[PDB]
Symmetry: none
Subunit: 419 residues, 4 copies
């Protein structure tokens, strides 16, 4: 397809790392996904008695000192600490040895939807109570979104392309796709790519609550996230990070890397419709998926698994069903599609990264993760949405969808790598 | 070069738009740049007695009603209003007509370094004084960084690739280079690319002041920004936006577009050194410029003009001189390099977009804009830095450099088009 | 020793701040100390063409607006501006959050040797030329010595014990030692203590010049301050400030404070000998150091480093050698003693504060700062005086000595804190 | 109380010395205090037509040759001569014999608020009219505040702790309390402690005048100082000194010393409010008195006499009434409180030492000295302020308050010795 036509340089995944509401690493998170475990709970880290939503997907038991000194960590917003944890895990998982001979060829693209909201909140309190002199000196470099890419490159000595995306739900999906573009173009041999988020502060839960975006099912938080279910009432805000080591194929082979999967395509579109609520036909999402398949040189009939956007929103969920039916026709009923957000909630800038990882693991393990809480599928939601329980099945090709605020769409295509 | 080797699809600039401390459009800004005028003044829009820095580069007399309904505008942070203004100007300037036939082929990549800080500060006040149910419903959609790309795409019906960079000083440079990559790769025929910033709130001036990053020359704000001058004492915080319509060459030719210049190379690197100060030898900046020249298929001797990063910081300015000397050797004495931030201050996420525009206009007008305030060049700062006054000269190739917090580097290469 | 016998409440250092001739903060000053850099230069801030000494240790590039508004600062003598800058730095460095629950427990003891000499000079000029009605209304509250403690308590809301010492060279050493007494006694949990000076006006340089107290080595000001060198010819007048946050140990531990060191003893004596020239045997200084060691429960053999008084005076320097030989016997040859005044000059009321800080940093970094310019040690000056270059070495215990006009002696004892 | 809990070592007063506007020693001053005599008069010792205040509390007929050679004296500012006179009087009164056996155990803590202002003004004149080489060689050593402690230690051979406080009105109170701390802690057995002031020069009367801090009642100087009177218009500047020999009790007992009273508590606080005016509720003063009572192990109902700060200022006087009412509740109407500054004026750095002496003599003689000039008590000034005339009464416990510029507070607690 277009990717292979534009460069002979193929892109594979050789390392993964994650923090999620289900685990402090990939295997612990994935065990929870396959078991249909919810990571959603009442928030403990702050008092939400005055808030309309008092629950979400928190990282439980994170220890930044597994990754950084206490002193290094005090300077850094949680979204940075999370993105470094995922990145360091991914690089360790890859087995790559960074040297003087390769450091220029290794870059970073780690993004965030909202970035350092907690630090911004803490410094505004200092500003209003005591004045600008009590703002932290580390406020800017500890809070701006590109500092995951910055600090990761400083800690590991990575001198390749260095940047950060910020596209809401699509952040992690653009980051990975544009990192694959760098490698195939020849600007890098390796990229650490993905995203991180920690928006569970007063401003984040309050801001999404004021926009009426969030589920308010406080009495049963594990049932709140119910993509395609007729009783859904908005998304669950979740925290964490995902990172993937992307690598040119011959570079991976020459060092005896373990290859999880190949990244064979990347599609994008804009809805040009509305800030939050996509068109009911999912026309934009449909263009994005077709662009991704043409990029990969795949026919729709070759797709086995879709890791949906599936945020548990009235407008969003049904648009995605329509887009899949448009792109896949009869094959819509043969593929499996699931929303892992049923278990993790919506990790916003990290969603696309953690979901790329789940898509790769679906290929490794030949199993479609479930959509939990899909008790009463809404009108039209009659596909195999892997309701309730994991489904073992053949998976050669897995898509990951992200349809983010502003109508910004991205789709990744992963495929088994034979070796 | 590498870009030509990877795709036959050339990328040209067909439209430009801007808000800057020097003007409310490109021509008014550029007239200011060539006259050596300062856009820096004491900040009027808030009170700053408790701050060590009370001046910056403001956008003066912005009228959002030239671009949006007063309705639409009320919901949006100034960085979004600024981004939209530059974007709309660039699309108007391009002469491009969006139709059902091409809308899937036109995308947007508008970034910001810090985004909707004013809105975040105002909503934090509501939260602390009155609780979370008094936060504005418009807070998230009117504040998050990708809403410039989102709102532009909705208003103009653009259905191509849609995303947003956030790379501090490098934002506008990455936004433009990665948009050019999209077009050359084939996933768009047109992109609107650039950045915007309005970080002059208490958190912004306060935050950069707490880091001791800003000039504190309150008595003489127009002399504060003095890149490579021995008495520089940090950067000047500025507001604005820049946007460029990038276009595949056959698509531009087919509609009889006016072509300002060609985008021939884009280079990136990471210092992997320090969170804010570059290495003294500018090794990262040097790698980044070499990568961009190699992308463009240019020998260093083919470069005429460099629009510097040149933020007026002690460590940053001298590293860029070291990097240019490293890359260019004896040719470092033949090219002209200037920092327009001497006049504009540092527009952070918009710096790379307004300076790309300044680079393209240097090619159009065959003139190197000045580095004003360069009274006493520091030790080793002995290049043609176009001190004080614009220099008419031959300019076939113009570079634009951005060396951002975290050591993130980007360079663009523009060339005269035929 | 006596301190531990009189109270179970231990005193630790959790924050430090400084203005000196070597830097506008602690790390910049300390980098200069360890490099053997001189901060002494011809004075620029006034015309000294008619003066016998034209050089000193000035604060270079101070920006009061990093700490106060222009309008607030205009009312305050430079010695006050300097003391507030050091105090605000120390409190920020401590990370302590001042609240309604603790403000009564936080006090201030910031002193000065001479206080508001510049403001007094400017107001005398107004008085003699225009009469008493042109004296500034802020002249008293902007000039009297206790107004560093006053303004610091008003700005930060500190309601604990509030006072000011004035003991010439010993000012900063008494301020810190008596602040530690307050905390151990139970009168405070926290004290901001130290001192500040800006005596470089016509009256200060002229007054010390008339007393023949100052070096007149105008042709080579960086060589003027040469403690224990046979060619010394009096002290160098220097400006600046030092402040330390002293804190009860369990109070520091309970808030997760970073602890630099423990303040384990404080000694005092009077020479009862002479206004300026101590006895040749240093009998007073020797009693003061022994008092400090007995206060700390230390034997002389446990002392590793002494930050000397060492002002570069004929009588003073040799008295301190004698006192160290008397107190330490054979161990006098194993410890290291240095005068940082070789680099900073004599900061008078701030000396004891900046030198306490250097003693604490010698413990943090395990390095003895040099005595620069010690080219030809005088008769008897045969100890390890760390001549020329910093000396990395084991330092568990550091003393700071101040032997001030009137024969007023103080010694602080700092020791590593294990955590 | 806290002091007894922290050390078994009790502190007693065995000697007292004074210069005041009422006399050249303690019993002449005290005779004046008990007769309600004013020490305030037009200043003779300079000319004051250009000043809004031309009167104060001077020391009358001081003969330094009773204490020093005319040689020794010529080198010393009057504040030093005054501090030494009070110190020598206190040591004589104490009966203490300094020997080789005890000299290391006897220290000094004599403070001043402003120090050698007369000398600084005279040397400033030399500097301005004739240049820096006409400044006196005696200027620094005869002017800096710690030279009272320095010269006393040299003259009497005292080798104990040696220091000097400078806390405006609180100077003498801090000097005495912190000297008591030294003794109870064990770092001395004897301290000479107090303060001295001679600020009646052009800079002092001029400086306090420019701040509008002084009474301007030039027609009736003896009526100027009127604490808590509705027609008060600022303080009266006075000169002098006070010193007390503080002594550990077993040390006093062992030499058969005469013990005047015991020092049983010392309290401190900061207002953290304003540079010169206290909060109207006297919250800082209240905290300071409570701390002192808690240090002494006394219930408020055990207090019989308060020697007030009571400087005759609008904000200060009423804050102290509010603080006493807060601390003492219904007992505020049973105790007697007076301001001896009604007679002495404000001795600034010496106020705390002379008033400590007055508190001790109130215990000795069982009499509350008067607040003279208290003709028309202000709104809410309805306590027993001992208006007009001394009041014989039972006094077991006497407080002395000092509430100084910068909001620095100190209270001493004295008790009859049993």
């Amino acid at each position: 397809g277009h990717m292979a036509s534009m460069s002979r340089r193929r892109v594979v995944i050789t390392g993964m790392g994650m923090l999620s509401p289900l685990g402090l690493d990939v295997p612990s998170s994935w065990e929870g996904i396959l078991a249909g475990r919810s990571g959603i709970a009442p928030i403990e880290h702050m008092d939400l008695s005055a808030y309309s939503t008092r629950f979400g997907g928190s990282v439980k038991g994170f220890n930044v000192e597994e990754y950084l000194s206490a002193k290094e960590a005090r300077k850094l917003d949680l979204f940075i600490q999370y993105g470094l944890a995922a990145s360091f895990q991914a690089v360790r998982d890859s087995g790559l040895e960074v040297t003087d001979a390769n450091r220029e060829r290794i870059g970073v693209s780690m993004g965030s939807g909202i970035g350092g909201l907690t630090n911004i909140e803490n410094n505004c309190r200092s500003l209003f109570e005591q004045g600008p002199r009590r703002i932290s000196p580390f406020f800017v470099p500890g809070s701006i979104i590109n500092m995951v890419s910055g600090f990761l490159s400083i800690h590991l000595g990575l001198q390749g392309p260095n940047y950060a995306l910020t596209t809401a739900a699509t952040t992690g999906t653009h980051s990975i796709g544009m990192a694959a573009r760098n490698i195939a173009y020849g600007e890098a041999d390796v990229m650490v790519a993905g995203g991180s988020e920690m928006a569970a502060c007063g401003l984040g839960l309050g801001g999404f609550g004021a926009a009426r975006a969030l589920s308010t099912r406080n009495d049963e938080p594990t049932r709140a996230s119910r993509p395609w279910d007729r009783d859904r009432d908005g998304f669950v805000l979740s925290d964490g990070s995902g990172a993937l080591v992307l690598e040119e194929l011959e570079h991976a082979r020459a060092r005896g890397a373990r290859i999880y999967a190949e990244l064979v395509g990347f599609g994008m579109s804009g809805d040009a419709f509305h800030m939050t609520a996509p068109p009911e036909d999912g026309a934009g999402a449909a263009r994005c998926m077709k662009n991704a398949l043409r990029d990969a040189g795949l026919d729709p009939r070759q797709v086995d698994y879709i890791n949906a956007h599936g945020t548990s929103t009235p407008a969003g969920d049904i648009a995605e069903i329509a887009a899949v039916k448009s792109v896949f026709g009869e094959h819509a009923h043969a593929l499996s599609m699931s929303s892992t957000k049923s278990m993790t909630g919506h990790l916003l800038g990290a969603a696309g990264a953690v979901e790329a990882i789940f898509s790769v693991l679906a290929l490794r393990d030949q199993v479609a993760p479930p959509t939990i809480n899909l008790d009463n599928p809404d009108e039209g939601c009659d596909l195999d949405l892997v309701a309730h329980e994991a489904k073992p099945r053949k998976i050669d090709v897995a898509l990951s969808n992200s349809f983010g605020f502003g109508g910004t769409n991205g789709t990744l295509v992963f495929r088994r790598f034979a070796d």
